[PDB]
Structures are given as C-alpha cells and as structure tokens.
Design a protein around this ligand. Sequence first.
Ligand SMILES: Nc1ncnc2c1ncn2[C@@H]1O[C@@H]2COP(=O)(O)O[C@H]3[C@@H](O)[C@H](n4cnc5c(N)ncnc54)O[C@@H]3COP(=O)(O)O[C@H]2[C@H]1O
Ligand SMILES: Nc1ncnc2c1ncn2[C@@H]1O[C@@H]2COP(=O)(O)O[C@H]3[C@@H](O)[C@H](n4cnc5c(N)ncnc54)O[C@@H]3COP(=O)(O)O[C@H]2[C@H]1O
Ligand SMILES: [Mn+2]
Ligand SMILES: [Mn+2]
Ligand SMILES: [Mn+2]
Ligand SMILES: [Mn+2]
Lengths: 333, 333
Amino acid sequence: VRARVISHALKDILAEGDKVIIMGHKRPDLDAIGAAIGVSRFAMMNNLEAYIVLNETDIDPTLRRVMNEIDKKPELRERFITSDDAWDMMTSKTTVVIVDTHKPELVLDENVLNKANRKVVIDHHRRGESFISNPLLIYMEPYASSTAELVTELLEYQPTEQRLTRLESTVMYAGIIVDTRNFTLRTGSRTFDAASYLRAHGADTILTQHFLKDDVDTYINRSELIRTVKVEDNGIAIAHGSDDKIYHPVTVAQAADELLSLEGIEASYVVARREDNLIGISARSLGSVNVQLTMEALGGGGHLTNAATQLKGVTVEEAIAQLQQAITEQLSR
Amino acid sequence: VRARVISHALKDILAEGDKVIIMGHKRPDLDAIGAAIGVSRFAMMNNLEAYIVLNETDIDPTLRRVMNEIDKKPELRERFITSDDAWDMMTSKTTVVIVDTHKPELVLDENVLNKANRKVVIDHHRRGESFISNPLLIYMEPYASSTAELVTELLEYQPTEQRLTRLESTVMYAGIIVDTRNFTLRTGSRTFDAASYLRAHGADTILTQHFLKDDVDTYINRSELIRTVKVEDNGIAIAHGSDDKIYHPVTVAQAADELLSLEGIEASYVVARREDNLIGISARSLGSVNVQLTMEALGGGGHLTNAATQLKGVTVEEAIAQLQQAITEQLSR
Ligand SMILES: Nc1ncnc2c1ncn2[C@@H]1O[C@@H]2COP(=O)(O)O[C@H]3[C@@H](O)[C@H](n4cnc5c(N)ncnc54)O[C@@H]3COP(=O)(O)O[C@H]2[C@H]1O
Ligand SMILES: Nc1ncnc2c1ncn2[C@@H]1O[C@@H]2COP(=O)(O)O[C@H]3[C@@H](O)[C@H](n4cnc5c(N)ncnc54)O[C@@H]3COP(=O)(O)O[C@H]2[C@H]1O
Ligand SMILES: [Mn+2]
Ligand SMILES: [Mn+2]
Ligand SMILES: [Mn+2]
Ligand SMILES: [Mn+2]
C-alpha cells in the first residue's frame, strides 16, 4: 500500500516538471547506478524525458565494466550525461531525483543539486544532520537493503508497455547483490521480492558475476595472509603477513572479514606491515567476542564486531606478542 | 498454476490416510531435510500427524550441526523417527512422501518404501530410469532450484494458523542456498518468491551461513591449488597441484568452482593427483566454454559448465599436456 501511494505520487511529480535529472552519490557504486537506471525507466514508462548525471572521473573499475555493457545499447547509454550538460539543460521546472543518499555534500554534483528547484529523495539509510532541502517527495526506508530494492517496488505500479529491460534489471540486481553481499546482510522478504521482480525481467546471474569478479593478485595476497591463521579453542584466530612485506590495508581488512566465514572462528586478528614503521591489525568478530576492547587496549578502536589499530615502531612478531597480551588480559577480564 | 492444484490435492491425500511418513534420499543433504520439514509443517497445518525418517547413521557433519540446533532449540526433534519406528508405525493406510529423489534405491529406507501402499513423490530432477512405483501423486519440476522451493510454494495455499516456524524455514532456506550455491544456479523468480516467504517466516541467514562454513584446512588446501593458476587471454585458466601431493577430490572441485570468481577466467581446469596412479581434473565454466567437450576428449564428461575426468598412469605434467592438447584442438577458431 505504501509503495503504491509513493509510486503514483512520484509519477505525478515527474510528469509535472519539464524533465528528470537523476543523481546518486559521489563515487557511485552499483546500487546508486542501478537505482538511477531504475528511476529513468520509471520515467520512460510514462514517456517522460530523464537523464542520469555521471562524469568520467566518477567511473571506478567496477562501474567501468558496467559501462562497457551499457555502451552496447545507445538508448540506455544516451540517458547518461555530464554535470555540465545537466546544469545547462536544467530549468526551474526540472525535477532532480537524488538516489541512495540524502546529504547534500555526498551528492554527486552539489551545483546541480543547488540549481535544482524541484527535488526528490529515495534512500535507505537512517537520516542524519544534513538533508536535501525542501524535497517534494521523500522515500526513505532505513530497513530496506538498498535504493535499488526501493525503486523496484515503485516500478511495479507503473505501466508495463515499456518494460524494464534485461540489462537495466541486471544492473539493479547487481546493486542489491553488492549492498547485501549476496543476501547475507540487510536482507528481508522485500529484498527477495525485488530480486524476484528483477529476475522476472531478465536479471542475469552470470553478467552480475562478471561485474563483481575479484582480481587475481588480490586473491593471492589475501590468501597469503589467511593461510597463516592459528585458531585457539576459544575461537580466537590470528593471521599475519611477514615482517618484510607491506600489504594493502583493504587486503588486510578483507582477510579478517573472510576468516569469520571459516569454521570455529569467533574473532579474527590479522597483523600485517602497513609501512616501514607501522604495523596494522584488523579485528573482526561474529558478535560475541569484543574486538573493540582489544584494539583500544593497543591504541586503536572501532566497534564491537569491527575494529583495528596501527602500531608504530614494532615488528610483526612484536605486534603479535603485544596483541596476544591484550587478548589474555581481556579474557581473564 | 500447477502449484495451487497440487497443494490442495496433496492435502486431501494426506488427510485420507492415517498419518504421514516422510523420507528423502540416502545421506540426506539440507534440501532433502528442509523439504521433509516443509512437508511435515504442511501436515501440521491441517492437524495431520507426520514424521520424518532419520537414523543416526544418516547424519553427516553438516546435518549434525543442523540437528544440534534442533536439539537445543525447537520441539522439532519429536518428528524425526528411526527406520524401525517408521516401519512399526505404518499401516496400509499410511501415506509415505518421498522428497528430493524419485529412484527407489536412493530412498533413505527402501523397506519403509516397500511396506507403503500410498506413495507421493516430490522432486526437482529429471525423471530417470527407475521410479517410485504406483504413486498417488507425482510432482516433478526439473527446473525448480530445489525441492525446498517446490514445497515452499505448496505451503502458501494451506491454512495459516499453525505457521511455519523460524527454525523450520531456516532449514528450508538452507536447502535452497546449497542447491543454488547462493542464488547463482537454477535461480528463477519463483526461487526468490520462496526465499521471500521463508525470510518472512523468520529464516535466519546468519544461522544458515553457520551450517555451511568450510574448515580452515579446506581453505588452505583449496587456495594452495588456486595460487598456481595461469590465465590465458581467451579466459582459459589452468591450475594444478604438485605431482607428489595427493589432494582430496572435493578440494579440487572447489578450487575449480572458486576460480570462476576471478577476473579473466571463463573456464577453469584444476589438475591434481588423486591416487598413487590416478590424476583428477575438475573443469568449470561460466557457460561460454563447453568443458563437457574438453573432458569428453580425455575420457570423462559431465555438463557444459561442470565436468571432470580421471587419468590412469600419468604425472600431473603429462595430464596438463593432454589437457592443453584437447583445448587447442577445441578452441582453435
Ligand atoms: N586507529 C584507530 N582508532 C580508532 N578506530 C579505528 C582505528 N583504526 C580503525 N578504526 C576503526 O576500525 C574499523 C576497521 O578498520 P580496518 O582498518 O580494519 O578496515 C577499514 C578499511 O581498511 C576497510 N575497507 C575499506 N575498503 C574495503 C572493501 N572494499 N572491502 C572491505 N573492507 C574495506 O574497512 C574499514 C574502513 O574503516 P572504518 O574507518 O570504516 O572502520 C574502522 C574504524 O571504524
Ligand atoms: N570419469 C567421469 N566420466 C564422466 N563424467 C564425469 C567423470 N567424472 C566426473 N564426471 C562428471 O563431472 C562432474 C564433476 O565432478 P568433479 O569431479 O568435478 O567433482 C565431483 C565432486 O568432486 C564435486 N563435489 C562433491 N561434493 C562437493 C561439495 N560439497 N562442494 C563442491 N563440490 C563437490 O562435485 C562433483 C560430483 O560429481 P557429479 O557426479 O555430481 O558430477 C560430475 C559428473 O557429472
Ligand atoms: Mn551506495
Ligand atoms: Mn545503497
Ligand atoms: Mn539433494
Ligand atoms: Mn535437491
């Protein structure tokens, strides 16, 4: 009932203006792009004129493989425009739709946002300090998985003659896959309803897998860290890189995350040289062992399931020894 | 749909008998068990009396984890009974329901099957040579993801007062996860519709991950194979173990599966010693290279995306040479 009311109100607004400018957040990910694609399909179903703001500097490596697919169909590709062309074509009757964010400084192009007289916000985060000013409509659902899921619900109440295409729903499906880490996070029944809808319109598993393929170098670095793991009977796992190899901090973080997927690990600590005078530790927990307190003890911090520290002037082995001492202190309380 | 008619037809057959006894295949996995759970909830939704046949020798380690949660946390345990208790309990008025298989010699207990006058078959595979004899109702859907999906659809039409429980829908959900490898195989829109129903009834994805976690040694051994990969520009990837190290056959198969998640790999071939005189090769692809043809050229076979072969009397290097000879011959244009 709620999405039906929101869907028709949004169609009223979009047809009420002179054209639709759709904008995600800075450095868009596949949920922002998929949501925007979904909103531009919302508009074409009602024969409206809609564009998505996207600059060349905005296209990261994951977005670039998606664009390589989008390039193969000029109708979809023609809907993408730059900040400048969006600015030049905007009037006081233009509706800007902000997808997958609600804070003016995270918007992909603040100047397009500032020129906008008519604004719409669709987002799935919890509202904070800053907010898009004077929105005509707000679709915010902090429990939903993604903005793609939200925009999918809106599509269902719109005319079906100009259906969502196979590539369009593949990108939207990819956004849900990324935001939920393939249905393991923030995933409810309505997430699966949206996936059902997208799948019924041709959303492609194999093309989604293509967008999200892992690099081979980084799989081999990550696994170099993982293979060293030692697990105590209490479920504490420790893994390390050698004292003379510098690991990327994202690789360390991913190793600590991936250890939680192995049997019998309640909490993971990955220790790897970050600079020549700096050792990094990434700590992750299933939710019972408190890795926040362990990292705080060593001069870092974070949250109970997700924390880290950096240690100046020690070797990897010294940082392991200092980490084990923090763990002992904390379990004897 | 076929699903409305079968659900009401099934309910009548089950209510006409004196009680329901439910069996999957030997060495049940989570689809078998989850489908059998779903069928027992189907009966309870109509206040019929239902049991699932399960012996201690049927319970592999994955199933043991599920059953531990079924001891510590439900009253689900009461509906699991041994072969002997099933036999002692049934009359010629008892309906036996076979889930997730249709061959009599793969059924969990063939004597319970033979003593049964009233039989029902629910399965999602292609009907083969042998078949359950004189069944009262046959529900074969070769393209459904799983039997858990099929049974989930039947539940929707039944009275809702004795609702599917959280732990019941979690197991059913887990069976879909295993059969689809997390929604990457045989996943249609009806697959997600079933996942939506189960998640709405409390299916726990974190508990589902818990049931399925790989141990550390399997990751180490699996990544030992993955590190060796060589990717060709045509997307052919080959990896191999040393000739003097024996790998477990599933580790090899999992190595080949996981290489498809890496950039540039259309098809994977993992070559590793299985015995002192036998080399295994597991092959996999994202559907664009036919690895059934590659493995048929070396005395094995399988399906276009999933194949293998075993080679007598060769070294890993000899096996790799024959593998590459087969590949250049097959991919030469
Ligand atoms: N010295 C210190 N004092 C107090 N608190 C500290 C701290 N160092 C770290 N933290 C806290 O610990 C969290 C984990 O940081 P870590 O370095 O392991 O891991 C980082 C980062 O390496 C990782 N990350 C970045 N990109 C990623 C990707 N694509 N996939 C997975 N993880 C990623 O996610 C985390 C992002 O950092 P974020 O700040 O959100 O979250 C940090 C921060 O909340
Ligand atoms: N000599 C031969 N001649 C003709 N065809 C052949 C053949 N050897 C294999 N095949 C075909 O190749 C498929 C792949 O077997 P593979 O050895 O890779 O790998 C095996 C097994 O190693 C692997 N596997 C078993 N449990 C697994 C698990 N928990 N996770 C991942 N993979 C698993 O799945 C496959 C199960 O074999 P399945 O019969 O379903 O399917 C086999 C069979 O269809
Ligand atoms: Mn985003
Ligand atoms: Mn998002
Ligand atoms: Mn099965
Ligand atoms: Mn099955």
